[PDB]
Amino acid sequence: KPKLHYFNARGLMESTRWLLAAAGVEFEEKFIKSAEDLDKLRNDGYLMFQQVPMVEIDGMKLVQTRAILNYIASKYNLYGKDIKERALIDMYIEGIADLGEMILLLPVCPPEEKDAKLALIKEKIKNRYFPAFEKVLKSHGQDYLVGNKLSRADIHLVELLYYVEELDSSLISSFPLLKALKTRISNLPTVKKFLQPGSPRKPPMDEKSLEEARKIFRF
Amino acid sequence: AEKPKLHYFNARGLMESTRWLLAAAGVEFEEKFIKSAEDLDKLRNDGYLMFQQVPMVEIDGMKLVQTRAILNYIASKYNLYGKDIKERALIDMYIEGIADLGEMILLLPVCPPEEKDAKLALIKEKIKNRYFPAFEKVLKSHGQDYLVGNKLSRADIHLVELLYYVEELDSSLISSFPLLKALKTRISNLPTVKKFLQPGSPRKPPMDEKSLEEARKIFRF
Numbered sequence: 001k002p003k004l005h006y007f008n009a010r011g012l013m014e015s016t017r018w019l020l021a022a023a024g025v026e027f028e029e030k031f032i033k034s035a036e037d038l039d040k041l042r043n044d045g046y047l048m049f050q051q052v053p054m055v056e057i058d059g060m061k062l063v064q065t066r067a068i069l070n071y072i073a074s075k076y077n078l079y080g081k082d083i084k085e086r087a088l089i090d091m092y093i094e095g096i097a098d099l100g101e102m103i104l105l106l107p108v109c110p111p112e113e114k115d116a117k118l119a120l121i122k123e124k125i126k127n128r129y130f131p132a133f134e135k136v137l138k139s140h141g142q143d144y145l146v147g148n149k150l151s152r153a154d155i156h157l158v159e160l161l162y163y164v165e166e167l168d169s170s171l172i173s174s175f176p177l178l179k180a181l182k183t184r185i186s187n188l189p190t191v192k193k194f195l196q197p198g199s200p201r202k203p204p205m206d207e208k209s210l211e212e213a214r215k216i217f218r219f
Numbered sequence: 220a221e222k223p224k225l226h227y228f229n230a231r232g233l234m235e236s237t238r239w240l241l242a243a244a245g246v247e248f249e250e251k252f253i254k255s256a257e258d259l260d261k262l263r264n265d266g267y268l269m270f271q272q273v274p275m276v277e278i279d280g281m282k283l284v285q286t287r288a289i290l291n292y293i294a295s296k297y298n299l300y301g302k303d304i305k306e307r308a309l310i311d312m313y314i315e316g317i318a319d320l321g322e323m324i325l326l327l328p329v330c331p332p333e334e335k336d337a338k339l340a341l342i343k344e345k346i347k348n349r350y351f352p353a354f355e356k357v358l359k360s361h362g363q364d365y366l367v368g369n370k371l372s373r374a375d376i377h378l379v380e381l382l383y384y385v386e387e388l389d390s391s392l393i394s395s396f397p398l399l400k401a402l403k404t405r406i407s408n409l410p411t412v413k414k415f416l417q418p419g420s421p422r423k424p425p426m427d428e429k430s431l432e433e434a435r436k437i438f439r440f
């Protein structure tokens with residue numbers, strides 16, 4: 001089974017949790033709880049750049065979120081049929097990641113910058129990102145983003161939709177095809193299982209969990 | 220049928236690694252330089268930019284935005300992305316490390332003036348203590364001339380590009396890393412990369428204050 005080394009939070013690992021779950025792959029987590037737990041990983045030679053996420057998979061120890069994701073996507077045939085399809089996938093999921101990163105640093109930003117950053121994100125979802133993905137879907141009228149077939153792009157997008165919902169349930173309301181995709185993907189047996197109570201899916205980061213991160217990652 | 224066309228402003232920015240990679244692959248390309256916010260607006264209105272941003276590259280009859288999408292496609296097309304999934308993961312791991320350090324360096328002139336000095340010091344420490352030791356360790360592990368699969372890949376190209384940037388930053392930083400210095404020399408001597416380093420190539424200079432003002436106007440920040 002793949003083993004995920006991270007702290008007990010969404011952070012940089014949650015999209016890996018989603019992708020693995022969506023692929024039907026059972027994994028294990030080893031939760032880092034302290035600065036010393038992290039330092040033990042570092043000491044033991046487990047972390048190429050002294051950082052997590054790190055995933056032990058197929059007998060090697062992989063750091064770098066995108067390295068982890070690309071490998072899993074390829075392995076479980078969720079990265080398209082060919083390099084042209086991979087190009088569409090990569091374009092879409094990099095837009096999703098840009099938005100995702102913004103949503104992630106929300107509580108980590110200075111408190112005096114939080115309001116402006118939230119307003120900015122909302123505007124980008126409204127005017128930039130949702131129109132772009134709605135456009136792709138309305139272009140080919142198909143149930144999936146690429147190749148008329150489940151890909152990581154669908155998984156990464158729907159994950160994002162859940163985060164946007166948490167922010168403001170109205171943001172999606174003028175994008176019927178995004179709403180429909182959320183529903184379809186969420187009803188896929190693997191994803192439906194991951195969405196159920198008690199799965200490895202992680203909650204939004206609260207103030208205590210942020211406090212933990214500051215201790216573990218020294219910031 | 221048509222050479223790739225790179226849409227960006229006349230500056231390194233987010234396009235420089237693509238310029239390096241295409242040149243290293245031996246691929247002639249064209250550039251269409253954005254001069255103003257109006258030029259970027261025209262791209263947006265023409266429907267050429269999926270997220271209303273550049274870098275954008277027209278290659279093989281399609282428009283690609285997102286630096287990583289562009290690079291991934293190029294690397295795969297020209298067999299600079301490893302021979303299998305495991306080699307790809309090594310490559311990805313290395314180049315994402317490189318990306319992290321490169322962004323730190325890129326965003327240095329856009330730090331508020333009072334944060335500028337402490338940030339630099341932190342960059343030097345991470346170069347010395349974190350990044351250069353990792354890559355020196357890889358080179359030492361196998362003793363081969365290339366990072367991955369004993370064959371040229373995008374990892375060698377991305378890393379050597381960064382070595383040149385670090386040299387601009389502080390020529391002393393590479394000093395205790397002999398294998399890194401050796402990689403830089405060998406890669407610089409490959410016919411394609413040699414041509415790219417010569418005067419007059421599409422390789423772009425370090426970004427100066429006035430270029431950065433051009434970016435503030437074009438990209439409205």
Ligand SMILES: CCCCCCSC[C@H](NC(=O)CC[C@H]([NH3+])C(=O)O)C(=O)NCC(=O)O
Binds near residue numbers: 011065066315319
């Ligand atoms: C907003 C919630 C906070 C999320 C937790 C912080 S991520 C922890 C941090 N890891 C990274 O920044 C890895 C970035 C890398 N580019 C990747 O994508 O994997 C780390 O190990 N830091 C230790 C170090 O760099 O020294």
Ligand SMILES: CCCCCCSC[C@H](NC(=O)CC[C@H]([NH3+])C(=O)O)C(=O)NCC(=O)O
Binds near residue numbers: 098233284434438
């Ligand atoms: C240190 C300053 C260096 C100048 C670099 C400017 S990059 C310009 C900017 N592009 C992006 O942020 C693209 C990000 C994207 N994630 C990618 O990798 O391609 C843009 O088009 N912005 C316009 C917009 O987003 O509206």
